[PDB]
Design a binder for this molecule. Structure first.
Ligand SMILES: Cc1cc2nc3c(=O)[nH]c(=O)nc-3n(C[C@H](O)[C@H](O)[C@H](O)COP(=O)(O)OP(=O)(O)OC[C@H]3O[C@@H](n4cnc5c(N)ncnc54)[C@H](O)[C@@H]3O)c2cc1C
Ligand SMILES: CCCCCCCCCCCCO[C@@H]1O[C@H](CO)[C@H](O[C@H]2O[C@@H](CO)[C@H](O)[C@H](O)[C@H]2O)[C@@H](O)[C@H]1O
Ligand SMILES: [S]
Ligand SMILES: [S]
Length: 418
């Protein structure tokens, strides 16, 4: 009977495919469609960007692992979605009909917001994708051959601030390990955050003080409330505002090596569905992950819309992170299954939370924050070896699971208790 399509094979989409097939069984067709033929473990990208990891450590071909599970895989980008006819048009012009569609397309990296900021058009690189992280590293090596000013940070509208700090810190660390640090004219951190360690979540534990001291310790000069208007002639044009939005300065910073986390928007094939998304291209869903306009469209991951709780001097967004994403996936699968069986599924993603782990080498920083608005129930920022062991363990676990299959509540990791 019912044909369920999962669009996008990333952090939410890959497990979604397995969980979907596992829940529906042999009487239903599950098809996974994605723009790339390989899965990549995104949290490892910053390390790739500094050459501490290789593509081969963090990426692998999808086909065999999902097909052996009875899942169909189309390594093709969706270009157009007709929600009325329920047809997806692929890059190669073929079309795929669906009865249920689960959108897990992740972020469009919106380099267009800042002219000249695209990794291919200037010195400002990116570590959001393994492709980009490889490019970043390559440029980093050029920096090593001809030392120059470094600029790392997060654009206006960014939501993934952790990766910016992680990358700045591991770059400094790598520079030192190479006895190359003191050869750098200047190393500067530019962020749209209202203050250091805001992280798009109004700060967590002592994120402010600890990240502030960390940057200072590494001789990284830091500026907040910044937006970049353009990257041009290897200069970054920065405007810094006050709490009221008024300009308080403009800077022109030269860049030999740069990495700025861009704003995320929804991908075009999805943003292009009339009435499906908010103006940023994010899918508007109810608490059950069901599209508010189309009863047979669900969504999970960065792709869904989550309303802001704060309005910062420079536009910033709140991060969507792995544990909450899996919780969205789990609800979507349950609720589609319920549709395929009469009921309206009642499962939700649960309490909003942000969880992030960043490895520095032998130790790391991690935070856990919930719910979204303060006063919170848990508001922890921690640094230690346990964080490094956690991150290493989790990468290994997730990757193995993406090869072996996922049947169950993803975090039996909480069995290290029992
Ligand atoms: C650098 C970085 C580090 C991060 N580190 C952490 C971390 O340590 N911990 C944590 O919890 N979270 C982290 N996150 C955030 C979040 O967990 C990841 O961004 C996660 O990969 C998001 O999952 P997703 O499924 O929504 O999107 P993605 O993993 O990006 O997957 C989207 C998929 O859809 C595909 N796709 C897009 N458009 C189309 C289309 N039109 N047709 C077909 N396929 C398409 C893409 O190719 C991709 O496979 C990090 C994010 C970044 C950018
Ligand atoms: C992961 C979410 C956020 C992403 C940001 C990633 C960047 C993290 C880099 C910040 C590192 C800060 O740098 C570090 O601060 C901590 C905590 O105060 C250290 O360590 C300090 O606290 C504890 C444990 O928490 C130690 O065991 C220690 O002996 C003590 O000195 C400092 O010695 C300093 O080196
Ligand atoms: S995000
Ligand atoms: S993160």
């Amino acid at each position: 009977m019912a044909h369920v399509v999962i669009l996008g094979a990333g952090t939410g989409g890959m497990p979604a495919a397995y969980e979907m097939k596992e829940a529906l069984g042999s009487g239903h067709e599950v098809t996974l469609i994605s723009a790339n033929d390989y899965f990549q473990f995104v949290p490892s990208n910053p390390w790739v960007g500094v050459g501490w990891k290789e593509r081969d450590d963090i990426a692998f071909p999808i086909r065999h692992y999902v097909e052996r599970k009875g899942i169909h895989f189309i390594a093709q980008s969706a270009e157009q979605i007709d929600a009325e006819a329920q047809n997806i048009t692929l890059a190669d012009g073929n079309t795929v009909h669906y009865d249920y569609l689960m959108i897990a397309t992740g972020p469009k990296l919106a380099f267009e917001n800042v002219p000249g900021s695209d990794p291919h058009e200037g010195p400002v690189q990116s570590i959001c994708t393994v492709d980009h992280a490889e490019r970043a590293f390559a440029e980093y090596q050029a920096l090593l051959r001809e030392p120059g000013p470094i600029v790392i940070g997060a654009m206006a509208g960014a939501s993934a601030f952790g990766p910016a700090y992680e990358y700045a810190m591991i770059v400094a660390s790598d520079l030192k390990k190479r006895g190359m640090r003191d050869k750098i004219p200047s190393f500067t951190f530019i962020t749209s955050e209202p203050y250091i360690g805001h992280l798009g979540i109004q700060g967590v534990g002592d994120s402010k003080g600890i990240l502030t001291k960390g940057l200072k310790e590494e001789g990284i000069e830091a500026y907040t409330n910044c937006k970049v208007t353009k990257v041009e002639d290897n200069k970054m044009y920065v405007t810094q505002v006050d709490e009221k939005g008024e300009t308080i300065k403009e800077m022109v910073l030269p860049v030999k090596f740069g990495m700025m986390i861009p704003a995320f928007k929804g991908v075009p094939a999805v943003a292009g569905v009339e009435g499906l998304c908010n103006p940023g291209g994010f899918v508007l869903v109810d608490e059950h992950q069901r599209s508010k306009k189309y009863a047979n469209i669900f969504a999970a991951g960065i792709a869904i819309a989550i309303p802001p709780v704060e309005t910062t001097p420079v536009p910033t967004g709140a991060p969507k992170t792995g544990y909450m994403i899996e919780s969205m996936v789990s609800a979507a699968v349950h609720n589609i299954k319920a549709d395929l069986e009469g009921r309206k599924g009642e499962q939700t993603m649960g309490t909003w939370n942000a969880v992030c782990f960043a490895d520095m080498g032998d130790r790391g920083a991690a935070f856990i924050a919930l719910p979204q608005l303060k006063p919170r129930k848990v508001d922890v920022f921690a640094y230690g070896r346990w964080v490094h062991l956690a991150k290493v363990a989790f990468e290994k676990y997730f990757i193995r699971k993406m090869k072996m299959g996922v049947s169950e509540p993803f975090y039996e990791k909480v069995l290290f208790k029992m």
